[PDB]
From Swiss-Prot, chain A:
Disulfide bonds: none
Molecular function per GO: rRNA binding; structural constituent of ribosome
Signal peptide: none
Subunit note: Part of the 30S ribosomal subunit. Contacts proteins S5 and S12.
Protein source organism: Pseudomonas aeruginosa (strain ATCC 15692 / DSM 22644 / CIP 104116 / JCM 14847 / LMG 12228 / 1C / PRS 101 / PAO1)
GO biological process terms on file: translation
Pfam families assigned: Ribosomal_S8
Source species, domain of life: Bacteria
The entry's keywords: Ribonucleoprotein, Ribosomal protein, RNA-binding, rRNA-binding
Cited function: One of the primary rRNA binding proteins, it binds directly to 16S rRNA central domain where it helps coordinate assembly of the platform of the 30S subunit.
The protein's name in its UniProt record: Small ribosomal subunit protein uS8
HAMAP family assigned: Ribosomal_uS8_B
Family: Belongs to the universal ribosomal protein uS8 family.
One Gene Ontology CC term in the entry: cytosolic small ribosomal subunit
Swiss-Prot record, chain B:
UniProt record similarity statement: Belongs to the universal ribosomal protein uS12 family.
Sequence positions bearing 3-methylthioaspartic acid: 88
Domain of life: Bacteria
Residues annotated as signal peptide: none
Gene Ontology cellular-component annotations: ribosome; small ribosomal subunit
Name of the molecule in the record: Small ribosomal subunit protein uS12
Organism from which the protein derives: Pseudomonas aeruginosa (strain ATCC 15692 / DSM 22644 / CIP 104116 / JCM 14847 / LMG 12228 / 1C / PRS 101 / PAO1)
Function: With S4 and S5 plays an important role in translational accuracy. Interacts with and stabilizes bases of the 16S rRNA that are involved in tRNA selection in the A site and with the mRNA backbone. Located at the interface of the 30S and 50S subunits, it traverses the body of the 30S subunit contacting proteins on the other side and probably holding the rRNA structure together. The combined cluster of proteins S8, S12 and S17 appears to hold together the shoulder and platform of the 30S subunit.
One of the record's GO molecular function terms: rRNA binding
RNA sequence: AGUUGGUGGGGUAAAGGCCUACCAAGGCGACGAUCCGUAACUGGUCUGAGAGGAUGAUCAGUCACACUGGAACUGAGACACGGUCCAGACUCCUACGGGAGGCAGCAGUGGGGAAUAUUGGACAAUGGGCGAAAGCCUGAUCCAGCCAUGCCGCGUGUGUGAAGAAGGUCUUCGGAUUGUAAAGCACUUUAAGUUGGGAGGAAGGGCAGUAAGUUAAUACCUUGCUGUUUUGACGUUACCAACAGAAUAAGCACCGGCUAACUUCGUGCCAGCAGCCGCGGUAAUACGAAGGGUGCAAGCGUUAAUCGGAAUUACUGGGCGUAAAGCGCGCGUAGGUGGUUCAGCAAGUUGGAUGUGAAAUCCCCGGGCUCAACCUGGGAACUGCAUCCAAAACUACUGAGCUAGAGUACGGUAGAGGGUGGUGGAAUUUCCUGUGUAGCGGUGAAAUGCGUAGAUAUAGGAAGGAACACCAGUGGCGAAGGCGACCACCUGGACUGAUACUGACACUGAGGUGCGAAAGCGUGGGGAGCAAACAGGAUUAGAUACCCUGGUAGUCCACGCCGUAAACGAUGUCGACUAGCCGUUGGGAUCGAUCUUAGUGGCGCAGCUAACGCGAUAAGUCGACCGCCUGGGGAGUACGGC
RNA sequence: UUACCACGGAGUGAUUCAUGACUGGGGUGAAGUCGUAACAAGGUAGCCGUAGGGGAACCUGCGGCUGGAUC
RNA sequence: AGAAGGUGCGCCGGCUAGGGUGAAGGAUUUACUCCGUAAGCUCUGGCUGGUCGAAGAUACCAGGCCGCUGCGACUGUUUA
């Protein structure tokens, strides 16, 4: 019944990335917007736009580079059934730093690298590589 | 199993029962030969196997196998038994130690004669 | 039921139902009370990459106990381990009247067991009791004795030496191997043996003098220093040196694969071996020996036990279409989880500071014993808990919102959805009556059976029970089980279109609650056809079957029970995404065509799967919750509850 | 002399061990006796639930499934 | 099932709680009426002492109980 909207966002991105599409549209929220922005800063997507009119729609344009999609493995970590939190010393590494893990901290939603840069841990949302 | 299901009822370790219920956590135990007889192995094998029925200090009554070519066990012989199952004989779970109390070990044996209680020929 | 709270009082070193008299009826429990079984706890130990699993010998901290059950006294401290009293069980002394005893202190004995040691020395050192001080006591302690029980170290010689000696073994009879191995030749003396030297564990005590302080006093006394004397169980110490000689000192398991190491001779499904596969019945690299070899080595094997490998209880890190595994199906309680905006709060979360987290142990850098084991300095760690400070993304909590989830109001559509009555036509059977006469029926072929007491066929009439051809469809409706004649009455739900409304009211669901084919059970009706049981005839070696002729329960109705099915898509419910093509049942739109919903079928790209195969009606990509599985039998059985 | 109370008595229950004449199934065995139920359309297609019957595998009725061959 | 089994019980005081009847008073329907009554009489209790005997349900009165089995379901009837 959409008890996790972020998992729906990542599932939509993965499913339409596998299907060789160009734009993904979904209901938006101020958390999905932060996730989309942090992906944009990491070069995993082309662009994201938020619609107006009371029921905003968020649309994301994807990248392909070669014949294979740029995002090959995206996975949610902290679900509503588990709620995983980690400290600075325990922030997970995906592909030994070749990827990124999104972390929600009291300074906002950022990457694990920025998380150690500010020295603030938090909740591990998902891992992308 | 889901995380909530596991919280309500965690995973359980199974316990493995010992194959030697007599001699409760003991390396060896002594007993008395209530009778010495001879029996026949299972299907693919054909032989005439020597076995002694032994009553232990526990009060248990079990059957032990006598190794080697010869033996001198008879009624009311005090013996020591150790673990070890004989595959061909059904119901035989123990071995009789040669050369410990009343078994005297095999004679004219010269190779590997420490499992049969034989002194160095010298 | 002093049970839970209150008041007055008592009592204790001290709070308190700790106790007492009244007042009230409370307290605990599915976050597991009560009851049953088992067990001292921790630092730690062993395994494991870790997470975990197993476990509390030795050493250290705490607790409890002192033949069994009670009780108090003395005391700063005890309900008292070598104290008192009372009772009990069990031993013993006795002159027969009468008393004593408690090794779970150190040695020791019997017993039990597979199994665990000396009736040793000294208070020299460190501690403890008393004394003022000498000093006395101390089975604490320090040391010795025994035991390959473990960990570590060192020996059992070194170099040269080819007639490749003799012997053993194998052979193609040439030889190969044991093998530089042996012998011979030349070296060295570790350890053990004998003899001579020789520390360190030692601080102090006694005596005399001296110098300070003590007062009021050079006295006594305390303290410094000087001189002399005196102390060791271990102990024939550690250690060092000299002497003769190679002399004093290798065993155990295995050799088919897993697994490093191969051939002969005996034996012939015997004797035997074996962790698992399995060897042995006349050429056995698997049994038993011999030669050779391989692993370890003062040890080597076997047995018992824990963890690992085992991702084989899977948090990390598994599964449920067919291998084990989705409840027969709904509704719903506790619980778990929660669409989207603001604002607040700071429980979760994050960062910092402070206190604690005993020592020992494990880890790092060092220091000593000739090395190592061992001892020891410093550090790191002890991943935890607690209190303050700060942050506000997420979760939780509070206030106000919103309409994308959910629901309400209004017209229509389809339907074997359910219940109570009534009514139809075809057909079977039975009874009556007419005509008519020798067969009917059934089979693979027969027979039983029905017929001249007039059958079957044929015509008319009557009675009664049950099922509802053709429509009929990969068709429809229902949560599932299931629901087909027609009509009336009562009644649930679903599809479909627009507008308006409520404003998260949602999903799942352990327990519980209902519905639930057929067969079956109870009471009362009904009974045409069919038909378990049963009778007879066939078939057959037999035929308690298949086949034939009959035939009772049952099948039908009302009410009640029963709770099961290959109750199946062998596939839990809910939500969101992901190329296409061909049908079909309801309904909408736009112009027979195009689009769009809710079902019901056939193919198929990615993806998935062990494969078959699934593939928008997933078994694909993901979320929320629940159920279930852990080798085959025994067994969905026994016992207990309901 | 009273209060508290250990031992010890009396009555009646619960639970748990061992044992018991005699009985019911199960497993493992070897060249035994009787049949041939399943696997092919296994020679009457097999299974599932329920009822009756029979030396035994099993047969028959009622409902269900395909995890059934020919077509 | 009164299963089985157990505890108390006499007499004299102290304190204490209830019920019935019922003057005086009050009301109106003024009379064979309604409410209600101090004393007296009468019937139920509670917790606290003391005291005698060998014994307090003291006499008469007044169930014995339990465990396995056969038969008949039971209450009833029958050979004056
Ligand atoms: Mg073994
Ligand atoms: Mg009280
Ligand atoms: Mg008080
Ligand atoms: Mg009080
Ligand atoms: Mg419990
Ligand atoms: Mg214990
Ligand atoms: Mg592991
Ligand atoms: Mg560990
Ligand atoms: Mg380790
Ligand atoms: Mg423990
Ligand atoms: Mg000890
Ligand atoms: Mg201690
Ligand atoms: Mg403590
Ligand atoms: Mg202590
Ligand atoms: Mg304590
Ligand atoms: Mg104690
Ligand atoms: Mg003792
Ligand atoms: Mg004792
Ligand atoms: Mg005592
Ligand atoms: Mg006393
Ligand atoms: Mg006293
Ligand atoms: Mg005192
Ligand atoms: Mg004590
Ligand atoms: Mg004492
Ligand atoms: Mg004591
Ligand atoms: Mg003590
Ligand atoms: Mg003692
Ligand atoms: Mg005494
Ligand atoms: Mg006594
Ligand atoms: Mg006594
Ligand atoms: Mg003793
Ligand atoms: Mg002792
Ligand atoms: Mg003890
Ligand atoms: Mg002994
Ligand atoms: Mg013994
Ligand atoms: Mg020993
Ligand atoms: Mg000892
Ligand atoms: Mg001393
Ligand atoms: Mg003296
Ligand atoms: Mg002594
Ligand atoms: Mg030693
Ligand atoms: Mg040994
Ligand atoms: Mg030992
Ligand atoms: Mg030779
Ligand atoms: Mg020497
Ligand atoms: Mg000295
Ligand atoms: Mg000497
Ligand atoms: Mg090999
Ligand atoms: Mg061998
Ligand atoms: Mg041979
Ligand atoms: Mg072998
Ligand atoms: Mg051999
Ligand atoms: Mg051995
Ligand atoms: Mg072992
Ligand atoms: Mg084990
Ligand atoms: Mg083992
Ligand atoms: Mg494991
Ligand atoms: Mg294992
Ligand atoms: Mg593993
Ligand atoms: Mg898991
Ligand atoms: Mg598995
Ligand atoms: Mg599941
Ligand atoms: Mg199967
Ligand atoms: Mg299910
Ligand atoms: Mg199902
Ligand atoms: Mg269900
Ligand atoms: Mg349920
Ligand atoms: Mg249910
Ligand atoms: Mg079932
Ligand atoms: Mg529900
Ligand atoms: Mg709820
Ligand atoms: Mg939310
Ligand atoms: Mg909630
Ligand atoms: Mg907020
Ligand atoms: Mg913190
Ligand atoms: Mg520590
Ligand atoms: Mg050193
Ligand atoms: Mg703030
Ligand atoms: Mg006729
Ligand atoms: Mg007719
Ligand atoms: Mg159906
Ligand atoms: Mg029925
Ligand atoms: Mg019936
Ligand atoms: Mg009936
Ligand atoms: Mg009837
Ligand atoms: Mg009939
Ligand atoms: Mg028939
Ligand atoms: Mg018939
Ligand atoms: Mg009939
Ligand atoms: Mg019947
Ligand atoms: Mg009916
Ligand atoms: Mg069905
Ligand atoms: Mg099933
Ligand atoms: Mg299955
Ligand atoms: Mg279901
Ligand atoms: Mg589903
Ligand atoms: Mg629903
Ligand atoms: Mg769904
Ligand atoms: Mg859905
Ligand atoms: Mg397909
Ligand atoms: Mg699969
Ligand atoms: Mg598979
Ligand atoms: Mg999940
Ligand atoms: Mg979940
Ligand atoms: Mg899920
Ligand atoms: Mg099993
Ligand atoms: Mg088993
Ligand atoms: Mg088993
Ligand atoms: Mg059962
Ligand atoms: Mg049993
Ligand atoms: Mg039962
Ligand atoms: Mg009695
Ligand atoms: Mg009793
Ligand atoms: Mg008793
Ligand atoms: Mg019994
Ligand atoms: Mg018995
Ligand atoms: Mg018997
Ligand atoms: Mg059959
Ligand atoms: Mg057959
Ligand atoms: Mg058949
Ligand atoms: Mg046949
Ligand atoms: Mg078949
Ligand atoms: Mg069954
Ligand atoms: Mg059947
Ligand atoms: Mg039947
Ligand atoms: Mg039956
Ligand atoms: Mg039959
Ligand atoms: Mg039937
Ligand atoms: Mg059928
Ligand atoms: Mg009575
Ligand atoms: Mg008296
Ligand atoms: Mg009585
Ligand atoms: Mg009685
Ligand atoms: Mg009887
Ligand atoms: Mg009798
Ligand atoms: Mg009678
Ligand atoms: Mg009678
Ligand atoms: Mg009778
Ligand atoms: Mg009767
Ligand atoms: Mg009767
Ligand atoms: Mg009467
Ligand atoms: Mg009577
Ligand atoms: Mg008479």
């Amino acid at each position: 019944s959409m008890q996790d909207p972020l998992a729906d966002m990542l599932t939509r991105i993965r499913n339409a990335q596998m299907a060789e599409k160009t734009v993904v549209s979904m209901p938006s929220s101020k958390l999905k917007a932060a996730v989309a922005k942090v992906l944009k800063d990491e070069g995993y997507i082309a662009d994201f736009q938020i619609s107006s009119e009371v029921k905003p729609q968020l649309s994301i344009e994807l990248k392909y580079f070669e014949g294979k999609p740029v995002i090959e493995e995206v996975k949610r970590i902290s679900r509503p059934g588990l709620r995983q939190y980690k400290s600075v010393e325990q922030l997970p590494k995906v592909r030994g730093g070749l990827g990124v893990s999104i972390v929600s901290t009291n300074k906002g939603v950022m990457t694990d690298r920025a998380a150690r840069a500010a020295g603030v841990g938090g909740e591990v949302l998902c891992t992308v590589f | 199993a889901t995380i909530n299901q596991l919280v309500r009822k965690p995973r359980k370790r199974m316990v493995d029962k010992s194959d030697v219920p007599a001699l409760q956590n003991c390396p060896q135990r002594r007993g008395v030969c209530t009778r010495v007889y001879t029996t026949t192995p299972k299907k693919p094998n054909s032989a005439l196997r020597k076995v002694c029925r032994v009553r232990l200090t526990n009060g248990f009554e079990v059957s032990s196998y006598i190794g080697g070519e010869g033996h001198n066990l008879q009624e009311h012989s005090v013996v020591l038994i150790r673990g070890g199952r004989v595959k061909d004989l059904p119901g035989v779970r123990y071995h009789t130690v040669r050369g410990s109390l009343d078994t005297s070990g095999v004679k004219d044996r010269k190779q590997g004669r420490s499992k049969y209680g034989a002194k160095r020929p010298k």
